[PDB]
Amino acid sequence: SSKTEQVTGATGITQSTVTAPLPEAVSSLSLAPTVNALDPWVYLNQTEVPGGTFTVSSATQPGSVLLELEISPELNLYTSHLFRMYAGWSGGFSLKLLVAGNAFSAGKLIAAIIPPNIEVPNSAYLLTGFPHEILDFRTADSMEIIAPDIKNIDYHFRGDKLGKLVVMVYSPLRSTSADFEIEIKLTSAPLPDFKFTMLVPPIQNNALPIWSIPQAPPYSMVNPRSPLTPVVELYINSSYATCNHQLGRYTIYQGAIGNSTFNPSGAWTATCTAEAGSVTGHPNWRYALLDLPDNPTFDPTLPPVPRGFCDWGSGVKSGNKQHLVCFTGKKVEGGFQDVDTHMWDYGDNETVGLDNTYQRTIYIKDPSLEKDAQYLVIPMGVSGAANDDTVQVAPNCYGSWDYAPTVAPPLGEQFVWFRSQLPASKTTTTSGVNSVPVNVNALMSPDLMCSAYASGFPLGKVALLDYVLFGGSVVRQFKLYPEGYMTANTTGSNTGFIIPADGYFRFNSWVSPSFMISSVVDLNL
Amino acid sequence: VTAPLPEAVSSLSLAPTVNALDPWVYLNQTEVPGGTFTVSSATQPGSVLLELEISPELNLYTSHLFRMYAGWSGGFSLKLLVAGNAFSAGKLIAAIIPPNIEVPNSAYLLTGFPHEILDFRTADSMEIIAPDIKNIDYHFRGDKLGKLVVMVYSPLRSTSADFEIEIKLTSAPLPDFKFTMLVPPIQNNALPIWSIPQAPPYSMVNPRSPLTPVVELYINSSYATCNHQLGRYTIYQGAIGNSTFNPSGAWTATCTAEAGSVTGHPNWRYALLDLPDNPTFDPTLPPVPRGFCDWGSGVKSGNKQHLVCFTGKKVEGGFQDVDTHMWDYGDNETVGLDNTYQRTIYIKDPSLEKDAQYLVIPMGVSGAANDDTVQVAPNCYGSWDYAPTVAPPLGEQFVWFRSQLPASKTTTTSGVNSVPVNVNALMSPDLMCSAYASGFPLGKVALLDYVLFGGSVVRQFKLYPEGYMTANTTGSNTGFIIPADGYFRFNSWVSPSFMISSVVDLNL
Amino acid sequence: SSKTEQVTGATGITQSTVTAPLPEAVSSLSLAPTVNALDPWVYLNQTEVPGGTFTVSSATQPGSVLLELEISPELNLYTSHLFRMYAGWSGGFSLKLLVAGNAFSAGKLIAAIIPPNIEVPNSAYLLTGFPHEILDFRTADSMEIIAPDIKNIDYHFRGDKLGKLVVMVYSPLRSTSADFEIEIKLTSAPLPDFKFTMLVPPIQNNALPIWSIPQAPPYSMVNPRSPLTPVVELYINSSYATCNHQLGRYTIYQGAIGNSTFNPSGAWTATCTAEAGSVTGHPNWRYALLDLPDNPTFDPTLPPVPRGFCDWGSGVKSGNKQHLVCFTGKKVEGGFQDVDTHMWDYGDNETVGLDNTYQRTIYIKDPSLEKDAQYLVIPMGVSGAANDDTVQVAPNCYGSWDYAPTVAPPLGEQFVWFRSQLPASKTTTTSGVNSVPVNVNALMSPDLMCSAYASGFPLGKVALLDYVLFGGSVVRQFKLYPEGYMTANTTGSNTGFIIPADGYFRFNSWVSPSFMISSVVDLNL
Amino acid sequence: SSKTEQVTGATGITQSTVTAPLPEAVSSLSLAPTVNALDPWVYLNQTEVPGGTFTVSSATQPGSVLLELEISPELNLYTSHLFRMYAGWSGGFSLKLLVAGNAFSAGKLIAAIIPPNIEVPNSAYLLTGFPH
């Protein structure tokens, strides 16, 4: 159908079109053991789908996809919630494309329905092949695409391959002002022919449409890299800080990836097989061997480092001048007689000729090391080392050890980290070690993700969560990727921006990975 | 007529006196008290722009009648009035949330509630039927009420010169709106109109200098926050840290400290400021007398700035000496803290007895940075109920009451000099005296017109209930004097997001 | 109605009665803005209610309540889940009392419906007053109580006071064998006149009927009391270990109660205002004062101890012979020059004449303490002290400081704790301190409760969660109270029972606080 | 009533509305010793009233009054002149608000009728109360 309305002032028209590029395959639900209807009003309450909106500016290139929505119960809050207690679904959705258009100057949108097991092309030219509609920003106000449930089975089960609605720019948006944009929302409502199949117990870990994050300030969320010092700030350093593997790498597909753990309390301790050997250069260095409880020493697949124990980053070229600091102690009956602060290198002095590495090979500066003993390790800090740059060093999986890939943020955004300050141990003693203050940053601490690891994360969607702080209300919008690297849209200088740790996150909406955040953090200071 | 959800007409069978209304109160053109908001390019998506409880406060008239009546039952037809353009593009979502449910803070969830999406292109005169969701035959006062929440869904872009869209709602009760139970009109439910007596600002009292008249009102772009404790008021009192309705009578205090002095100076004797309340110095009541200056900045001991006051030992109530004495407000420096209120006060005189009670009457500043330093009040210890630090909404600036503190030299090297400093104040108590009888409706802001001389010049500021005035200004040049020989006028209740059509350029 | 069936073998009868002690108030839903129906099958799928079952043995005393179910959407999985997207409900439920009866010998059950704002009496004698039914175990198989939605409002909103179904023993159960019991389940299904009112967005923190706990072994959940040593076991000591206030006291009404925190990483550090004074007895002791960041020193309402810092329990009478051990260090520019292990008492040497207390008053054994400095604290262990008994000492709120009440378990059950081992620091040095190995136990670490703090906990219901361990499958059933003290049914000797920390919890069913667990842990070793 | 015309070039619309926020109290003139009619054409010749025009620029502040016209014979040249030879008048006037508008960008006007012995408020917010 069609319907046209004269805009206020008679300076244009707004077209609200009901369109069905119609597969319109309505199943008889003959094989469904029972057919369950919905509250008639669910068909009448059109709700924003997870994935909208998408802003089409002048800097958008036709052929770049903007929406990729799988026609499923997840397009609606109420159907998404109802599906938790239902084995199968069967029916389409009426998807509305609300476009904040105007007689701006020009620009055309193309929306198409793509059937299952058909790759989504990246050109407006190819989209015209599919069943599709075209819009004109000069007159676009609505488009009720009657999206069908393209299927070869008489009713769906979880895990099937579903059809997709793809929206792309047909013609570039041209307007007098470079700031003119077009916010394009998209809402769904199940069609009348949409029914469920069976009543099954809800999944207590259901992939809920709405994610609830407890009002937990990050100063209580603490802390993979330095689990003895609380998080005090939130760092946004635009130094191209592509986070090489570290501790505290959690993703909600597997949980803890790399050598990350959910209980890093302290700075997870480890012991060593303090083997000894002739040492060139520094005789006072002894090559100790990390032991691997729960990961026996001889599995190239498993990590050659105790779970938890991880960077500080050391073992740079100059590792022989900049070191790490850890408590050490001879293991004796019932514990350790005495524990001091010795200088741990964890790197590439002589025996590996490597860079920073995740051996299984450490050097102490204590000459009292003996082979006939196991020595305890508790990292404390760095000694004489640079600050905030030599503590983010890049050791990596120089092996088959399944580790965390070096994650880099998408262009235009920089990582938001959880920081913490490490005090310096001074000693005016004839036998001691000297540390230097250092600030430590990390990705999402496990406490924040605990809700995500249970609440759920819709496939291909990065959570957009807010950040409110002390009065007056000030909200910064961050993006929390499933791989576990929260980011924020950045613009301006490259200053390391501190954001206070007092303030709680809040779920706003599921957004696609390529979703520019409206709120931009300005690097002024 | 766009109805988000059907209105359940209730037969008031359980109403002791089903009370009718004037048949002519039904005209869907009466403005909605507080229902005026502006959308700009800077309004981020999903920012709550309006929130009205579905109640007799939605109409200018039923709001007035509601003071006579203990109950009501009915809906409201709100008409939009969008002063948009041909070059404006954007969306609004207006959802009616159910009574007890909590208003979301993202559009993705607000869409869940019944709603309508409004284009600025075709939402100029859109009737919206707001229902009154209930499980009871009629409402009493205090019952949880439904709300309609207007929120920007697609930000406002402009195909041409960026313009500001001003929107406001006009309502008439649906034919089924009925009152009940006549009661005397002294109730809650603040009046839709607040008549401000024509008291010029210079007739009010500067709470932070109740000895010098308010000489001028001035807007400073730099002063982004107000940490003052003395001079803060709110209509929803409550208690505000060290603010009194009588600033003049509270400017006094007794002090007494034992043998003690600043390490850097054996001349700055300590002084424990006496409290009109009684000890212990319990960390739940103010640690200083209800009225005392909030001046000074976070200096460190040595060749520095500090305050001046009139001090004098008490003599059994009889004759007490008096003289201006240099005064600094605590040695927070020696504890690694900033200058706060809890810190004991000091006096630069070696002639204080370890057990004597000395008067103190602040009078100025000496050898000190200019007004910039007295503006920033000492911090607080975070244990008692003090006035929270506040800042104006983005793009808006404060309005302060200003006064001139006269200086004071000394011919002899016995007293103390005192540089002249212009002092500020967030609000004089003389303006809220009339407000309390009226009150502000449900977290709305009061747009007041400062009618400058003759009425040819009329400035508009928003009187936020929290206790401050703000006026939107585009400009540098911190100093901006506004004459204090004017008078206020109520213009309307405006939602906090409302931005003033009048913009006073700070560069003129 | 009624219906009788001849049991197999014709050795009895089983009565399945449909009863309506009928308020039967059906609302017209006139004021409801809209009326939403359900899938017709929800009315036909009777599901176990949260609160059943309840076993009526010979040791049950008439007048002891067994069921107290508020007639609400929460009586059914599907209605409980659907109510998440609904503002109001209006209608009753058909509650079935399935009784595993037999012609055992005798015994009668009484079930009554109690209207809102009417206290539940504790005598079968009074229950007969209410609308009620009586059962006989000799012939009881079912009872479809048509429970009405007693209300004076035309449809419900969350938070109203609801009616209650109470089941009590009318006559004692007598049977030939002392082991004969009667498992009494109870299921619900909304009546046909049950409808919802409005469609509202789901609460992302909804009080879900089913609780999902991630497959997180407790050896990763770590650890309030000793957040540097991982949890290794699970202790069940029947020493009457009524847990006085401690660290790690979390309840899902407020979150962290007492001085408990969600980020105890390490052993939350604290500093001191190392004031000095003349000391009698031991001159080498110096009375240091804990500073209170975020809790200024002068609020009798707030705790006089830094958040996190907490027991080890010291300050017993003999505190002058048994002590705690914490790292100490003079605070200097940028940190601390040197840090050693000194002996911290935290108790009642001279200045308080108290027992263990939660001052704000500590004694070091280092004579080098000086007033002009702040000294750091990091608890490590105990020195010369008893083990596992003097580390559970009972300091408490000797003041108005809102603390955690001393929780004791119900009779017949003992606490299940999260343990950990603290190594001993030995030192053969002319200046050092000597510790003694000690095992430390705690209540639920915050990681386990994180799901509860978001998943939800139905009012008055203690979660019954399982514990599966390495193959072959072995399941122990524990009860996790809302106040935050997991317990397990115990029988036999008083041996401290260790349960391996490898194995994950799992939600089984919501049960009442007075719900004997069928599985009994046997104290054999 | 209402009436809409498409502006030249079809780049807008011009609304010419006939509105009566209607007291519409028509007297029977029973007590009038005699009732005198006018030349029928006086009812058909709309003349500029004394007090118009008023230019609403960007520097105008809502709440500032612009017109305050007392409904009387003085609103028309011819009625004002005729009243010189007449002891009394009885009847209303059809007042036209010609606005030199355009699809400029925006801006809304409010006109209200205020009864006798009622002070004129200085806020657009209050004007909505009156018939307007």
Short mmCIF file of N, CA, C and O in Angstrom, two decimals, chain B residues 136-208:
data_model
loop_
_atom_site.label_atom_id
_atom_site.label_comp_id
_atom_site.label_asym_id
_atom_site.label_seq_id
_atom_site.Cartn_x
_atom_site.Cartn_y
_atom_site.Cartn_z
N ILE B 136 -7.90 1.41 40.83
CA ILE B 136 -8.83 1.92 41.81
C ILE B 136 -9.78 2.87 41.10
O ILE B 136 -9.48 3.40 40.03
N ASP B 137 -10.95 3.08 41.71
CA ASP B 137 -12.00 3.84 41.03
C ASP B 137 -11.61 5.31 40.86
O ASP B 137 -12.05 5.96 39.91
N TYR B 138 -10.80 5.84 41.77
CA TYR B 138 -10.33 7.21 41.65
C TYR B 138 -9.08 7.36 42.50
O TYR B 138 -8.80 6.53 43.37
N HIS B 139 -8.33 8.41 42.22
CA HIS B 139 -7.05 8.63 42.88
C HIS B 139 -7.23 9.45 44.14
O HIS B 139 -8.15 10.27 44.25
N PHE B 140 -6.34 9.22 45.10
CA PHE B 140 -6.14 10.12 46.22
C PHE B 140 -4.86 10.92 45.96
O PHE B 140 -4.23 10.79 44.91
N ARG B 141 -4.47 11.74 46.92
CA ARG B 141 -3.21 12.45 46.83
C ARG B 141 -2.10 11.55 47.36
O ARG B 141 -2.24 10.94 48.43
N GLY B 142 -1.01 11.46 46.61
CA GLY B 142 0.12 10.64 46.99
C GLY B 142 0.18 9.28 46.32
O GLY B 142 1.23 8.64 46.36
N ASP B 143 -0.92 8.83 45.71
CA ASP B 143 -0.89 7.57 44.99
C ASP B 143 0.07 7.66 43.81
O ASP B 143 0.17 8.70 43.15
N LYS B 144 0.78 6.56 43.55
CA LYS B 144 1.68 6.52 42.41
C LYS B 144 0.90 6.76 41.13
O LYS B 144 -0.12 6.11 40.88
N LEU B 145 1.37 7.70 40.32
CA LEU B 145 0.66 8.14 39.13
C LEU B 145 1.47 7.82 37.89
O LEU B 145 2.71 7.78 37.92
N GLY B 146 0.77 7.59 36.79
CA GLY B 146 1.43 7.34 35.53
C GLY B 146 2.13 8.58 35.01
O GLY B 146 1.90 9.70 35.46
N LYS B 147 3.01 8.35 34.04
CA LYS B 147 3.84 9.40 33.47
C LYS B 147 3.89 9.23 31.97
O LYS B 147 3.86 8.11 31.46
N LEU B 148 3.94 10.36 31.26
CA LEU B 148 4.25 10.36 29.84
C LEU B 148 5.63 10.98 29.66
O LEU B 148 5.88 12.09 30.13
N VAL B 149 6.52 10.24 29.01
CA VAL B 149 7.92 10.61 28.88
C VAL B 149 8.20 10.88 27.42
O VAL B 149 8.11 9.97 26.58
N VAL B 150 8.55 12.12 27.10
CA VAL B 150 8.93 12.50 25.74
C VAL B 150 10.45 12.42 25.65
O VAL B 150 11.16 12.95 26.51
N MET B 151 10.95 11.77 24.61
CA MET B 151 12.37 11.51 24.47
C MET B 151 12.74 11.63 23.00
O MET B 151 11.99 11.20 22.13
N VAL B 152 13.90 12.24 22.74
CA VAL B 152 14.35 12.40 21.36
C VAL B 152 14.81 11.04 20.84
O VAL B 152 15.70 10.41 21.41
N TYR B 153 14.18 10.58 19.77
CA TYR B 153 14.44 9.27 19.20
C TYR B 153 15.47 9.32 18.09
O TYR B 153 16.41 8.52 18.06
N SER B 154 15.32 10.26 17.16
CA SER B 154 16.31 10.53 16.12
C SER B 154 16.78 11.97 16.28
O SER B 154 15.96 12.89 16.12
N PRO B 155 18.05 12.22 16.59
CA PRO B 155 18.48 13.59 16.89
C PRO B 155 18.04 14.59 15.84
O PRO B 155 17.74 14.23 14.70
N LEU B 156 17.99 15.87 16.22
CA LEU B 156 17.54 16.92 15.33
C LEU B 156 18.70 17.34 14.43
O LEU B 156 19.64 18.00 14.89
N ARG B 157 18.63 16.98 13.16
CA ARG B 157 19.55 17.47 12.14
C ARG B 157 18.88 18.60 11.37
O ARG B 157 17.66 18.72 11.34
N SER B 158 19.70 19.42 10.73
CA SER B 158 19.21 20.57 9.98
C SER B 158 19.81 20.54 8.59
O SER B 158 21.04 20.52 8.44
N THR B 159 18.95 20.53 7.57
CA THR B 159 19.41 20.64 6.19
C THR B 159 19.90 22.05 5.87
O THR B 159 20.44 22.27 4.78
N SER B 160 19.74 22.99 6.80
CA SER B 160 20.19 24.36 6.63
C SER B 160 20.59 24.87 8.01
O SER B 160 20.83 24.08 8.93
N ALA B 161 20.68 26.19 8.15
CA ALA B 161 21.10 26.81 9.40
C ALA B 161 20.49 26.11 10.60
O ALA B 161 19.27 25.98 10.71
N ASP B 162 21.35 25.64 11.50
CA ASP B 162 20.89 24.89 12.67
C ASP B 162 19.96 25.76 13.49
O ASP B 162 20.35 26.83 13.98
N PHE B 163 18.72 25.30 13.66
CA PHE B 163 17.70 26.03 14.39
C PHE B 163 17.22 25.21 15.58
O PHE B 163 17.43 24.00 15.65
N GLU B 164 16.58 25.90 16.51
CA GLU B 164 16.08 25.30 17.74
C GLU B 164 14.57 25.16 17.65
O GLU B 164 13.87 26.13 17.37
N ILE B 165 14.08 23.95 17.90
CA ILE B 165 12.65 23.67 17.86
C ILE B 165 12.10 23.81 19.26
O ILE B 165 12.57 23.16 20.20
N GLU B 166 11.10 24.67 19.42
CA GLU B 166 10.43 24.87 20.69
C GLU B 166 9.09 24.15 20.65
O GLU B 166 8.28 24.39 19.75
N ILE B 167 8.86 23.27 21.61
CA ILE B 167 7.65 22.46 21.67
C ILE B 167 6.98 22.70 23.01
O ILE B 167 7.64 22.95 24.02
N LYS B 168 5.65 22.64 23.01
CA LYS B 168 4.90 22.75 24.25
C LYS B 168 3.53 22.13 24.05
O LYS B 168 3.01 22.07 22.94
N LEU B 169 2.96 21.66 25.16
CA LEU B 169 1.77 20.83 25.15
C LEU B 169 0.57 21.62 25.67
O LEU B 169 0.70 22.39 26.62
N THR B 170 -0.58 21.41 25.03
CA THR B 170 -1.83 22.01 25.45
C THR B 170 -2.82 20.88 25.74
O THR B 170 -2.96 19.97 24.93
N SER B 171 -3.49 20.96 26.88
CA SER B 171 -4.30 19.85 27.36
C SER B 171 -5.68 20.32 27.77
O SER B 171 -5.87 21.45 28.23
N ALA B 172 -6.65 19.43 27.60
CA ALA B 172 -7.97 19.55 28.18
C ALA B 172 -8.35 18.17 28.71
O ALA B 172 -8.10 17.17 28.03
N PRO B 173 -8.94 18.10 29.89
CA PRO B 173 -9.35 16.79 30.41
C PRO B 173 -10.34 16.12 29.48
O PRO B 173 -11.18 16.77 28.85
N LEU B 174 -10.24 14.80 29.39
CA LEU B 174 -11.18 14.05 28.59
C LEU B 174 -12.57 14.20 29.18
O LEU B 174 -12.72 14.51 30.36
N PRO B 175 -13.61 13.99 28.38
CA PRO B 175 -14.98 14.19 28.88
C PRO B 175 -15.28 13.46 30.18
O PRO B 175 -16.29 13.76 30.83
N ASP B 176 -14.43 12.51 30.57
CA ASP B 176 -14.68 11.66 31.73
C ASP B 176 -13.92 12.10 32.98
O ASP B 176 -13.94 11.38 33.98
N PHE B 177 -13.26 13.25 32.96
CA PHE B 177 -12.48 13.68 34.11
C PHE B 177 -13.41 14.18 35.21
O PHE B 177 -14.18 15.11 35.00
N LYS B 178 -13.31 13.56 36.39
CA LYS B 178 -14.17 13.90 37.52
C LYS B 178 -13.32 14.08 38.77
O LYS B 178 -12.40 13.30 39.03
N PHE B 179 -13.64 15.11 39.55
CA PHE B 179 -13.06 15.33 40.86
C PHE B 179 -13.94 14.69 41.93
O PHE B 179 -15.06 14.26 41.68
N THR B 180 -13.42 14.65 43.16
CA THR B 180 -14.18 14.10 44.28
C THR B 180 -13.76 14.79 45.58
O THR B 180 -12.65 15.30 45.70
N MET B 181 -14.68 14.77 46.55
CA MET B 181 -14.38 15.05 47.95
C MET B 181 -13.76 16.44 48.14
O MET B 181 -12.57 16.60 48.42
N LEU B 182 -14.61 17.45 47.94
CA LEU B 182 -14.25 18.82 48.27
C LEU B 182 -13.45 18.89 49.57
O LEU B 182 -13.84 18.32 50.59
N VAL B 183 -12.32 19.59 49.51
CA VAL B 183 -11.48 19.85 50.68
C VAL B 183 -10.96 21.28 50.59
O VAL B 183 -10.96 21.89 49.51
N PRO B 184 -10.51 21.84 51.71
CA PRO B 184 -10.08 23.25 51.69
C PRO B 184 -8.88 23.44 50.79
O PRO B 184 -7.99 22.57 50.73
N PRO B 185 -8.80 24.56 50.07
CA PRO B 185 -7.71 24.75 49.09
C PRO B 185 -6.41 25.25 49.71
O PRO B 185 -5.94 26.36 49.46
N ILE B 186 -5.81 24.41 50.55
CA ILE B 186 -4.51 24.69 51.13
C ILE B 186 -3.63 23.46 50.92
O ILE B 186 -2.67 23.23 51.66
N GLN B 187 -3.94 22.68 49.89
CA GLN B 187 -3.34 21.37 49.72
C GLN B 187 -1.93 21.49 49.14
O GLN B 187 -1.36 22.58 49.02
N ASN B 188 -1.36 20.34 48.79
CA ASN B 188 -0.15 20.24 47.99
C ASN B 188 -0.55 20.50 46.55
O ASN B 188 -1.57 21.15 46.30
N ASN B 189 0.25 20.04 45.58
CA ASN B 189 -0.05 20.33 44.18
C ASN B 189 0.09 21.82 43.92
O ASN B 189 -0.90 22.55 43.78
N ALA B 190 1.34 22.28 43.92
CA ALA B 190 1.70 23.68 43.72
C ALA B 190 0.87 24.36 42.65
O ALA B 190 0.47 23.74 41.66
N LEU B 191 0.61 25.66 42.83
CA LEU B 191 -0.21 26.40 41.89
C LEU B 191 0.43 26.40 40.51
O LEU B 191 1.66 26.41 40.39
N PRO B 192 -0.37 26.40 39.45
CA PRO B 192 0.21 26.57 38.11
C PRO B 192 0.87 27.92 37.91
O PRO B 192 1.71 28.05 37.02
N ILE B 193 0.51 28.91 38.72
CA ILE B 193 1.07 30.25 38.62
C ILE B 193 1.75 30.59 39.94
O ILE B 193 1.23 30.26 41.01
N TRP B 194 2.90 31.25 39.85
CA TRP B 194 3.63 31.72 41.03
C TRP B 194 3.81 33.22 40.89
O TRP B 194 4.59 33.69 40.05
N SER B 195 3.10 33.98 41.71
CA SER B 195 3.17 35.44 41.69
C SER B 195 4.35 35.88 42.55
O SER B 195 4.31 35.75 43.78
N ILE B 196 5.39 36.39 41.91
CA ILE B 196 6.60 36.83 42.60
C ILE B 196 6.43 38.31 42.94
O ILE B 196 6.21 39.12 42.03
N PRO B 197 6.52 38.70 44.21
CA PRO B 197 6.39 40.13 44.53
C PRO B 197 7.53 40.92 43.90
O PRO B 197 8.67 40.46 43.83
N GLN B 198 7.20 42.12 43.44
CA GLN B 198 8.16 42.91 42.68
C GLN B 198 9.22 43.49 43.60
O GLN B 198 9.26 44.70 43.84
N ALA B 199 10.10 42.63 44.12
CA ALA B 199 11.18 43.06 44.98
C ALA B 199 12.46 43.12 44.17
O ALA B 199 12.92 42.08 43.68
N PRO B 200 13.07 44.29 43.98
CA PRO B 200 14.30 44.35 43.20
C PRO B 200 15.39 43.53 43.87
O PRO B 200 15.40 43.37 45.11
N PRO B 201 16.32 42.99 43.09
CA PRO B 201 17.43 42.25 43.72
C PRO B 201 18.20 43.06 44.73
O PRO B 201 18.64 42.51 45.75
N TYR B 202 18.38 44.36 44.50
CA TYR B 202 19.11 45.17 45.47
C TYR B 202 18.37 45.29 46.79
O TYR B 202 18.96 45.71 47.78
N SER B 203 17.09 44.93 46.81
CA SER B 203 16.32 44.91 48.05
C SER B 203 16.52 43.62 48.84
O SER B 203 16.08 43.55 49.99
N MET B 204 17.15 42.62 48.25
CA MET B 204 17.39 41.35 48.92
C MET B 204 18.71 41.40 49.68
O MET B 204 19.44 42.38 49.64
N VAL B 205 19.00 40.31 50.38
CA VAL B 205 20.18 40.21 51.24
C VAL B 205 21.15 39.22 50.62
O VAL B 205 20.76 38.11 50.24
N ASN B 206 22.40 39.63 50.51
CA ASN B 206 23.46 38.74 50.05
C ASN B 206 23.79 37.76 51.17
O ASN B 206 24.40 38.18 52.17
N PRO B 207 23.42 36.49 51.08
CA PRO B 207 23.64 35.58 52.21
C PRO B 207 25.10 35.40 52.56
O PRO B 207 25.41 35.01 53.69
N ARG B 208 26.02 35.68 51.64
CA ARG B 208 27.44 35.53 51.89
C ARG B 208 28.13 36.84 52.23
O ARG B 208 29.36 36.87 52.32
#
